[PDB]
């Protein structure tokens, strides 16, 4: 209109959510509980010698 140009109003997103990126250390000692559980049950068997004889 005349010399000036008119532009439409811009709609705005109401909310934003922040989810930052985190470094991944990738440690291996955690989630190894099964090995500890296996260590718990060694179960060495010893039979008395001389009771039979």
């Amino acid at each position: 209109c005349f010399g000036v140009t008119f532009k439409k109003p811009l709609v705005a997103e109401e909310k934003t959510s922040l989810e930052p990126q985190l470094p991944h250390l990738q440690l291996r000692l955690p989630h190894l509980v099964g090995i500890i559980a296996k260590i718990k049950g060694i179960k060495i068997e010893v039979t008395s010698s001389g009771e039979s004889i």
Partner: protein, 49 residues
């Protein structure tokens, strides 16, 4: 969201909420909590609402 993205174990979660709370309180200690005018000063219905 941060707790789920990481793998916090119900004890480092309390170490994260404490930091978030103290930082947010420090920010909130210097803000006045007002309202943004958007309409017309004459109107009574908005003020009544």
């Amino acid at each position: 969201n941060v707790a789920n993205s990481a793998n916090l174990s119900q004890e480092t979660k309390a170490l994260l909420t404490e930091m978030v709370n103290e930082e947010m309180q420090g920010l909130s200690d210097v803000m006045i909590d007002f309202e943004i005018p958007l309409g017309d000063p004459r109107d009574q219905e908005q003020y009544i609402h």
